[model samples]
Target: SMEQVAMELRLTELTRLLRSVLDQLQDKDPARIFAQPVSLKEVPDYLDHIKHPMDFATMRKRLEAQGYKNLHEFEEDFDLIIDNCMKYNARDTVFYRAAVRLRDQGGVVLRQARREVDSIG
Candidate 1:
């Protein structure tokens, strides 16, 4: 029973970490533009520029499906969304600025989680 509890507890912790990151991103982006996939019609060359497109909705779906096995996997999706934004939009645009800000905030969250779980003596 104790061993099973240990695994369950870790799973809960990981879920919390993943959600914290996602919630922070969504809250910061009030426009909800980044909330879904990019419109192909609006930005025809989006695919041509971004090899892999990532969005909050997609991340949530993956989270619900338990697609992420660990923090590292979850981090990748977070990074992808920001990276895709910066790549598709130029530095002067609102999209790029929003992505930059999110990148900084997300970095803090991931770093804190990493240290708390892996650095405690």
Candidate 2:
């Protein structure tokens, strides 16, 4: 159940960060109007060609070209969706199932890559 635990931890962390961001926005705009958080599974649809081997700078430019002002804005929205999905435990059926499968498989690859990168750098 490591994946489930990790998912829960990730969800909690993201939710905390999102709440902090919302609080900051609320202070700036007392009206407290905020968009409903998007579902996490909807994220990959918005991010095209993420598995490419582009450099960070190039990737940033490409993301911006997709209407994101910058990487942080893109990350925030992505994280927001993930946080909402995790908190609510709601699935979008097709997208969620697909993402869960990807995550389950990809986690091992990512961990190995991180280990290799860490050893090299």
Candidate 3:
């Protein structure tokens, strides 16, 4: 419960920062107008094609920094949270496993922050 909360909070903060970055970049670039990942040269047109490396721990710290004691303490914004997470490049998976027996997590989620990034990246 706490872990999921933490994950969402971080996603909330990240969404804010990410949106800000998008705004600035979109103002200057053309592709920025996509506001999404579109079909690429015959690829599926679904925006769902994009992916990201979920970093769980950093998400918790960000929420804590914002005075959030827990994620559920806020609202369940899983939709936007995961959406934002889809593009963030952090909390990488190095030689990641392939099954529940060897796997560690599941995200927004925050089952465990097993891996480490560059000092919370």
Q: Which candidate is the best by lDDT?
A: 1
Alpha carbon lDDT of each predicted model: 0.80, 0.39, 0.35
Better of 2 and 3 by lDDT: 2
lDDT of 2 by residue, 1-121 (tens): 8998986665454444434433333343222112232323765443342322212233334343443432255345434433433333448654345335433543454455445434633
Q: Can you list the residue pairs that collide in candidate 1?
A: none
Could you say which candidate leads in TM-score? 1
Q: Considering summed lDDT, which 10 consecutive residues are worst modelled in model 2?
A: 29-38
Alpha carbon lDDT at 103, candidate 3: 23
- Candidate 1's clash total is 0
Off by over 4 Å in 3: 30-121
Tell me, what's the RMSD of every candidate?
2.8, 18.2, 13.9
Better of 1 and 2 by TM-score: 1
Better of 1 and 3 by lDDT: 1
Question: What is residue 106's positional error in candidate 1, in angstroms?
Answer: 1.8
> Ten residues in a row with the worst lDDT in model 3?
94-103
Alpha-carbon runs more than 4 Å astray in model 2: 1-89
lDDT of 2 at 45: 46
